[PDB]
Paper text:
[name] has a C-terminal [name] domain presumably perceiving the upstream activation signal, and an N-terminal kinase domain that could dimerize and phosphorylate other downstream factors, including TAK1 and NF-κB. After depletion of the intrinsic [name] in HEK293T cells, both NOD1/2 full-length and NOD1/2 [name] domains failed to activate NF-κB, which demonstrates that [name] is the predominant downstream signaling adapter for NOD1/2. In this study, we demonstrated that the innate immune adapter [name] forms a helical oligomeric structure upon activation. Loss-of-function mutations in NOD1/2 and [name] are associated with autoimmune diseases, such as Crohn’s disease and lupus.
Numbering used by the authors:
A (entry chain K), B (entry chain G), C (entry chain H), D (entry chain D), E (entry chain F), F (entry chain E), ...: 430 to 516
């Protein structure tokens, strides 16, 4: 609950960093594992994959991160730690 | 009348499948034959061709399918059967 | 139905592996047999063949894998087993 | 007027064929003669020349064919007849 | 006064043609020369440049054509004649 | 019509074989007879003749085989039979 | 103030020329020096770098030229003079 | 001004001929004298020198011919006359 | 004009024969007289003289035959008649 | 932190030089050591390795340099100093 | 698994050395044993064998080394040890 | 700086002459002294040494001359003066 909420909160706590740190591949592989574990429907997936710029593709994931809770978010947190990108 | 209505009804009966089964090319070739036989005006055609995602481009055709009746719809039914996509 | 759905699901179950395991030739020969048996229209084929990177060419096939069902997918599963690549 | 309208209408009458019959060179030489006789502005020319697939490059010309009338279209009709491609 | 009024009236006299004849580049270059000579404020310019379809972008200019009089309109008339598009 | 379509279809039916069976000379002599009978424009001919690998030069012909119909394809079928290569 | 305003005004005074005179390299080097001196944020930079045509990439810079004032614009004026392109 | 404009216009007047008449050496020597007199930046030069076919390398110069005016074009006109190729 | 065009057309009319009939010496002496009368630049000459096989050296001349018109071609026609090879 | 930031800032401070000074081998060896120490994912690596021109391949690395921080950048700074290229 | 992964990792650990140490014959014999044991398809084999420089032919193998895992890589490790080249 | 820049500029000032005046031995000895003093990496050296024609081998050096500055260029200027070739 708490650290579950903190997980997406930490995303929201450092969201400016995710605009900086997350690449397209850091995005698109993270788009993959969500679509792999089916944490996102494809209609929402097409929304992120059609935005023109990186930051436009970033924010659509990160807005969808908030509405989908912790398990959607924890893997993205795990993505940046499995990257060891440490942003 | 009846099967004429059923034709667009069958579209509405399996609309979730058309979100699944219809591609962009299954869309855009179907956009072609409607524009070929002039079953759609170009103002409505530009509406479908400008939506950002596939499903956004799907639903705009499928909403326009209902208001335009059977002959607009029967060719789209014929499109999926001329595809032999069988969705 | 079920294993038919599981076939493209197994693709979606291990999609990160297909980003890893599938080469260009593992891609392009798989593009061939689909185009050989006419499981893909050429407009969708040109979409995959024009993407700049391997992973960009990978994802376009794999997105088209989901919308086209089992027979489109089963041969790609058969491709990796006829490769005996075992990914 | 009439056959002038029929000229671009015949294009719209068989547009699926132009997706089939017209190549890249059948496209790009037709792009040339329009740009030769200045029937197209270069901003519209860059739109066609930047689309990724053939069919994407096809449709942009063919959409621009309708808005530009007969003289823009008659040479394209003459192109397919000077090709003797007879599509 | 009169031909000044007729200039935007001729636009209104053949407005259906401007939905047909005017392209995006015929639009956007005409958007340029108005913004070049500062016949439009940028807030009104952003209104036209954000509409999703061509016809949506067409009508916003053409509605703004009526409220801004002759000098705003005469250059657009001159645009179609400098195009020699003759619509 | 039918066997005319089957002729290029048989090419598409066994396209993996044409990646295997067709050599460079089996390619380039087939490029000759098409250019001899003027079934290909030289702009499309330069596209095939500039690809770096055999298979890259193979696929460009075989993609151009589909868009150009039967008479373009029947001689290539006749080429493999005049070769008596029997692939 | 005045010549500061005139600097971006001169850009707006001859904007049709910048559609003509500015190349991609005249664009992209000008995109560089702005990003070098950090006169543009990268989110706005990705907007220009993703537009499909030259003129689409031109106008996005030139629209961003107006909202960012003189120092953003003076270097672009200096760019065309350091080019000695004299447009 | 006029004959200055006519110089690049004559290029555009007979552009189909330049697709025909200009060789690679007629291209690449013309690429040299532009790069000799520094009428082209090297970023634009690399764009022409990387296109796969002759016509692809032709059109990139000829598109860059229009945006760069007369002095960029007059030497290319002088190139074909110093060639005495008379196309 | 006509027989001037027919001269290189007759080359294109029987190009398969030139793959057959023309030797290396029938090639290289024909390369000489073109270089003697300066109908070819040396950069294009080095292109033909570096291809590995006869047919590779044949096609490079014969492709250069089309872009260089009649006087470049008429001597090659005269070469085969001064040979009295009669191909 | 500071000199860590300055390291990628110095890259951004002299980015026009990196368009000049960095070769393909200065690029591709620098692409190697990043891929050697795994400072880049291969999806981002394929993006740089597929761009057509040097400068297109340059900017994709240099854009990826900013989003990946100091350790990604410090080795590239070390690359130019281990080159002793001193740009 | 681990030393299996380390085997291709050791390749990636010292990849700069493989640019140095591996010759053409150290390459091409290694290309042989992979093609002998059928660890590579011929389409991927033609990709390596067509690159112009040694390092271009090196990197294409070494990129294909990563996507094909351990057994593809272990023999290449065994190749350098059967060479006793000890790089 | 200035004469340092002029040194490679003089190369660019008379580049058509270097296409004329420089032989293969004037090339390859100049390739030697650069490789002797290690002004070129071997990956760039293999690029020049693999081009098929002299002019193809010429331009690759001369393009690499511009990106590598003065000391790379001054010895090539010294090469033509130590030749006393005086081109």
């Amino acid at each position: 609950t708490n650290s579950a909420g903190i997980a997406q909160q930490w995303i929201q706590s450092k969201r400016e960093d995710i605009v900086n740190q997350m690449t397209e591949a850091c995005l698109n592989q993270s788009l993959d594992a969500l679509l792999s574990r089916d944490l996102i429907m494809k209609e929402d997936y097409e929304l992120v994959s059609t935005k023109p710029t990186r930051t436009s593709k970033v924010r659509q994931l990160l807005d969808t991160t908030d509405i989908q809770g912790e398990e959607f978010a924890k893997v993205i947190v795990q993505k940046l730690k499995d990257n060891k990108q440490m942003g």
